[PDB]
Structure 1
Amino acid sequence: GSVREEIESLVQDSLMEMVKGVKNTIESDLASKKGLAQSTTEILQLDPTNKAFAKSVLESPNLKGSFLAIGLGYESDATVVENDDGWEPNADYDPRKRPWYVDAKRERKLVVTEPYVDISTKKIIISIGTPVYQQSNFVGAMFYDVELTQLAQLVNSVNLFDAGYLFITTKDGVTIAHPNAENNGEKFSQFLPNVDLKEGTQRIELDGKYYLVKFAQVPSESWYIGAVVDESIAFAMV
């Protein structure tokens, strides 16, 4: 039917606009933070082992304010030179086995992690990870934590004409932004079953009611943006 295709078209417009909005907030913010993280890393490579220097650099106020927290974890122990005022590394914390560290050591390069559960804030964030070198010798890696607070802002600003909403997931189906924030950190299947994580239009039945779902991908992060509408309500509206 034509009404049904119109709904699909409007969902598509809201989806494309959200894709573009993610790119223009998160990605440009990430691009800027990457150069800062890279330079900071090259500066610490002027005297890598010296914890007192790294500490002074990480507590310089512009840096301290551009990231949730920054830290350097050393190859030769589980100690972290950190700038996080509201956190300290508990008895067990081994930097060498956290994603930012492993990814950085693996790639020998600046990396960006998948969204992940932070030890400190317990919310989901992403990290820039950098290898810290000294004469070809790997001595540690750095994290530069980035809050995903803009995602929650994007998602809570759009209501698909009182029929539905948008949400965001990782490539593995983990929800990182949802109007109901209690859904974050859970697989999106928990609230939207029988939907494939793939781009293109799907119609599902859930408790005798019918929903239309569309996904678009944000390729540089490989996040998925989902748009879901209650088809009955939306049919009545349009």
Structure 2
Amino acid sequence: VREEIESLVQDSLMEMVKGVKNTIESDLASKKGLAQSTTEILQLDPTNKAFAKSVLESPNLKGSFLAIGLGYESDATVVENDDGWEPNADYDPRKRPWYVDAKRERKLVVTEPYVDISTKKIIISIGTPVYQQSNFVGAMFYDVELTQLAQLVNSVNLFDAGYLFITTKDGVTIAHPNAENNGEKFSQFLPNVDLKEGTQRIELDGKYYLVKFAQVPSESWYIGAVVDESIAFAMVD
């Protein structure tokens, strides 16, 4: 009997996570498409900054990212659509992670989590390189608000038994219902758990918890789901 309910919880837990992994991969691919196309369109006239300014204020694009901008290699200037942020003499775009990563990889990248100079929160960014006839001209950032990412992974009913979260391949937390955890290794809130695909079962504070991880292939992110085993058992009802 216990194994009857156990293998149905396990398998319903399988459902929700693979369902979430696909949803995250889709939204990620979608944001990457929007970023790639925006970059290519800016490359029609990459040093026409007035052009780039207008494009970044177009409403659908502007509303799809926390913030978008383009830093220039030659003059270290920034064209940017953040309504509550401007650079000053302490800011050089070329020293930033989205920029350095896009310059290094010479293609679209997704950064590690880092502190946003604007919101002062941990974020991630899509970074893209900008070319003028195969000369590197600068790079773009498309910032991703991580609490919105946490709402996205927690778009499934997890029996009301727990929650989902995301980590990098090194276990650095990317999304969590409590954003304070972003930027921390996940062992901070979920100790004695190894970062590996499959299911683990551990006790914490006198209760058992099921933990499921599923990899996101394209960025080697992990989707974590944690559920109170007892509440899970109940909430198949």
SS at match of 2:89: coil
Distance 1:9 1:224, change over 3 A: farther
CA–CA distance in structure 1, aligned partners of residues 5 and 181 of structure 2: 25
What do the CA deviations read for 1:17-75 (whole angstroms, capped 9, x no partner)? 34344345433233333333223222322332232222222223333233222111011
CA–CA distance in structure 2, aligned partners of residues 229 and 35 of structure 1: 34
SS at match of 2:210: strand
Does the CA-based 8 Å contact 1:212-1:231 persist in structure 2?
yes
Distance 1:53 1:211, change over 3 A: closer
Cα RMSD of the aligned pairs, angstroms, is 2.9
Does the CA-based 8 Å contact 1:71-1:81 persist in structure 2?
yes
Distance 1:160 1:4, change over 3 A: farther
SS at match of 1:159: coil
Does the CA-based 8 Å contact 1:25-1:150 persist in structure 2?
no
CA–CA distance in structure 2, aligned partners of residues 8 and 53 of structure 1: 58
Distance 1:197 1:5, change over 3 A: farther
Does the CA-based 8 Å contact 1:78-1:94 persist in structure 2?
yes
Distance 1:71 1:163, change over 3 A: closer
Structure 1 position 14, deviation (Å):
4.3
SS at match of 1:160: coil
Moved more, 74-83 or 140-149: 140-149
Distance 1:5 1:225, change over 3 A: farther
Structure 1 position 159, deviation (Å):
5.8
Structure 1 position 150, deviation (Å):
4.8
Structure 1 position 78, deviation (Å):
2.8
SS at match of 2:103: helix
Structure 2 counterparts to residues 20-99 of structure 1, below 5 A: 20-99=18-97
SS at match of 2:218: coil
Structure 1 position 96, deviation (Å):
1.3
CA–CA distance in structure 1, aligned partners of residues 155 and 44 of structure 2: 45
The number of residue pairs the alignment matches comes to 236
| TM-score, scaled relative to structure 2 | 0.81
Moved more, 133-142 or 222-231: 222-231
| 1:8 maps to 2:2 | no
Distance 1:186 1:86, change over 3 A: same
Does the CA-based 8 Å contact 1:169-1:225 persist in structure 2?
yes
Does the CA-based 8 Å contact 1:175-1:188 persist in structure 2?
yes
Distance 1:205 1:126, change over 3 A: same
Moved more, 154-163 or 89-98: 154-163
Does the CA-based 8 Å contact 1:203-1:212 persist in structure 2?
yes
What residue is the counterpart of 1:188 in the other structure?
A: 186
Does the CA-based 8 Å contact 1:14-1:160 persist in structure 2?
no
Which consecutive residues of structure 1, in runs of 5 or more, have no partner in the other structure?
none
